[PDB]
From a paper:
The NADPH-dependent FAD-containing oxidoreductase mycothiol disulfide reductase (Mtr) is known to reduce oxidized mycothiol disulfide (MSSM) to MSH, which is crucial to maintain the cellular redox balance. The crystal structures of Mtr Re and Mtr Ms confirm that Mtr is a homodimer, as also supported by molecular-weight estimations during protein purification. Each monomer, composed of 458 and 461 residues in Mtr Re and Mtr Ms , respectively, belongs to the pyridine nucleotide-disulfide oxidoreductase (PNDO) superfamily and consists of three domains, namely a NAD(P)H-binding domain, a FAD-binding domain and a dimerization/interface domain. In addition, each subunit contains a catalytic redox-active disulfide/Cys pair that is responsible for the reduction of their respective and structurally unique disulfide-bonded substrates.
Two structures of Mtrs from homologous Actinobacteria are presented in this work; Mtr Ms from the M. tuberculosis model organism M. smegmatis and Mtr Re from R. erythropolis, a biocatalyst used for the bioremediation of toxic compounds. In addition, a strongly comparable A 465 nm/A 280 nm ratio for both proteins, as well as the yellow crystals obtained of Mtr Re and Mtr Ms , support the presence of FAD in both proteins, although FAD could not be built into the Mtr Ms structure due to its low resolution and lack of significant density. Together, these results demonstrate that the detailed structural features observed and described for the structure of Mtr Re are representative of both Mtr Re and Mtr Ms , as well as other Mtrs across species. In contrast to the previously reported asymmetric SAXS structure of Mtr, the crystallographic Mtr structures from M. smegmatis and R. erythropolis presented in this work display a symmetrical topology, as described for most homologous oxidoreductase structures.
Residue numbers in the entry:
A (entry chain A), B (entry chain B): 1 to 461
Amino acid sequence: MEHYDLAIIGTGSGNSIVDDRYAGKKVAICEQGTFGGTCLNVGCIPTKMFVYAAEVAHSVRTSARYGVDAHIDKVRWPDIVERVFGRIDPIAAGGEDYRRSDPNITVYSSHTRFGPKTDDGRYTLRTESGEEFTSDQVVIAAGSRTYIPPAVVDCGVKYHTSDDIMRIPELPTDLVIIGGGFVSAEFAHVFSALGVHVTIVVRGDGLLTHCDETICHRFNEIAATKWDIRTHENVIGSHQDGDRIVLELDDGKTVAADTLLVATGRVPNGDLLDAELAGVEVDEDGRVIVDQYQRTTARGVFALGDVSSDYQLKHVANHEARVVKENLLRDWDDTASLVASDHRFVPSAVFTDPQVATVGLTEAEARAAGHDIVVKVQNYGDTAYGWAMEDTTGIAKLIGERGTGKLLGAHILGHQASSIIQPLIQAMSLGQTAQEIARGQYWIHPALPEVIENALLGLQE
Amino acid sequence: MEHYDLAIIGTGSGNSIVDDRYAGKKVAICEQGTFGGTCLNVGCIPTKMFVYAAEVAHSVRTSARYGVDAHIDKVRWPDIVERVFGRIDPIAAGGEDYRRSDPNITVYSSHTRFGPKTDDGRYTLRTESGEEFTSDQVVIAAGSRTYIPPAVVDCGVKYHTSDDIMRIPELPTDLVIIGGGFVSAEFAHVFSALGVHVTIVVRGDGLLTHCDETICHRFNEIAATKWDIRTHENVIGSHQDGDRIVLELDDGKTVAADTLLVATGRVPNGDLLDAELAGVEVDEDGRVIVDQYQRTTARGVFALGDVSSDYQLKHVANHEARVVKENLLRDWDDTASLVASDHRFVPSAVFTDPQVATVGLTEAEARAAGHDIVVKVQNYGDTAYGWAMEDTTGIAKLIGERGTGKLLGAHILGHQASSIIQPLIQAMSLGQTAQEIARGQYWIHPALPEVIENALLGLQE
């Protein structure tokens, strides 16, 4: 019989768990699909890669705006796909040899359930891969999986999410997109920059109704002038009609396009473990119960982001991986000095046209929290940039508590959003105020971040 | 003869100093070139404006690397120039009435100069503009003035600096550029992106020998391949030969090109004021002497910016104007509440191909300060930005003191250098330690600012 000291499933951040410290144990990291979890092969890392191809293919489109003329000539879609996913296929087969070919660890193939605890209290793990093995401690990453509404299970039309549409063999002539959220808004810009009309069919009223209000506003009012935005219009079902896919719409007006897309949201993958038997709560989501220290209800076993966090992102996953790989040594005894995850302020970034990056709380949140607010919206304009790009619609909305000047969540759309929210992230996370950032440091001028200046300067303080 | 409560020489930042507070006094100003100083009319706002047109004209050139095809098609040089200077011609004569006619002030013309103090100790100021008036306090902005070596008085060939080469009627077919002193080599990229061979002729050894050593190195060793870089070889004399100008070199290398450029450096403007009579020392440079509080040697009179400071930039000029506009009221008595400028770290940004941004001290300087250092080189590469863009040549130099994990100057070159040094600028200003900044906050994954991540992570701590 085989038995390890520590086990892992997903390796989004689960490959970061293996460190020194242990260095002399038996470890298994049974990964089911490509080593890297959801991070490198399907989720965060593989995205944002096509984005630069799209950004060049968009700057050529907008070249006329800057006294420049440029032609698309030809689109090397095969070369773009091989440049993106020809980079992460051998590297994927690299973090796997880390824990297969190399000694004190051994990894197997897909499937990793849970089994009844042994009489001596150890954790049982089951592969449907003709094998069963127990261990002492097992941490679960198991990434996340995109979710398709029943409209696809009533037909069988070929569907694509973030998992596969980046490796589609051909560039469509006309594309359908459904979903208003994180996973769906990137491909709209990414593809439309490469010469395809996309047809957005959401389930609410507009795109991404779970972000900033005064950012949803001016993202709707630029997405309308590029993509076909159908509002509610709940897709009732689909029926293929030869070539060209046609979905049936809530108001009868059936919509047609070449290729399909879905990705309305994600769900964690804790259910597939049947942890109900091993005394672990999963709670419908797949989220798997944890706490501050990512500690579940069973001993020695833990979980990480996506599968468990309240943010399905890799930075929170890395902090949770930090506390996981650290807490298997500072035993569950001392709830102090056991090191807890940072589940305060986190940034989210959706790279579309234009980019968007948010952090902290929105106006609705702080108004529901009872504080009086000094919100400002700085136009990507009055800076010495703005006019250099003829940027008319880019904005950075910054929220701060009055009296003291405590910034509480920024929301920026326009050129350079992620590398502009980062000063605001730094100020947010560790006891920085607002004026401090404003007139306590130089802003190079005419550097891009100058917006923050007029974003912070004009506040109450 | 007249006497005012406040006088000014130049309104580069002089339009911002008179900022309420007084609101009910008599104020006089003196403009020689154009109301608005060098920022709005010649310096910061321009130069960097054409840069985005050039950067689009460079992304088209590099599109081939990313499975993209794009054409140079057309350069709308007249439309670019009118798009640039259609912003600073009416606004210059708009922000000027802001501080000249309305609502209780009077400003005069021509170059002004100090005159002998009156018997009651008041400052006399002389405009060659027929009229003369004195005052009680006078601030000197006088920006900075471009400097041409004697190399031009031995020829008479048409020469261009930052003042005018952006408003040249046509775009040359082959261009020569001289000057390596002040951070001038922006126009090299700006023009070469628009289809003209530029010929750099320095006076030292390489381009801009007053920057970081291991950055001058890897910037010269890409500028050699993109632009025609002629090393040292002091031109001295010149002789124009029709359209294409040919300079005669001491070593025989006659250089040829259509249009010329002259950006070897700038010098402060204290000499032309003959302020020597009104008791203010004009040091060797021609500069205006001040100190922490921007306090010169005569009372009530002050100076700010490049005309007096040791930094020829507009952000430091605006901070010095910030302290100035307040210190004209808090008399020299309380030197503790007379408030001082922040003259530690200052950021510089040179917008070329690619951009570059520096802050604090370089490695040589910090070695001259006696600290043992934990320098890191991030390489701008294995991060997800360079991983998606095949970014090979961008770099980030981070300097830090050992033991505690301090910091002594960041230096970043690449696509996004100005808007990435700003988190590092904020970290510099207020005692954040490398350890704190690294994993004490979230950094968006996958996103450009991840470059800072492994720049801080891969350290002694």
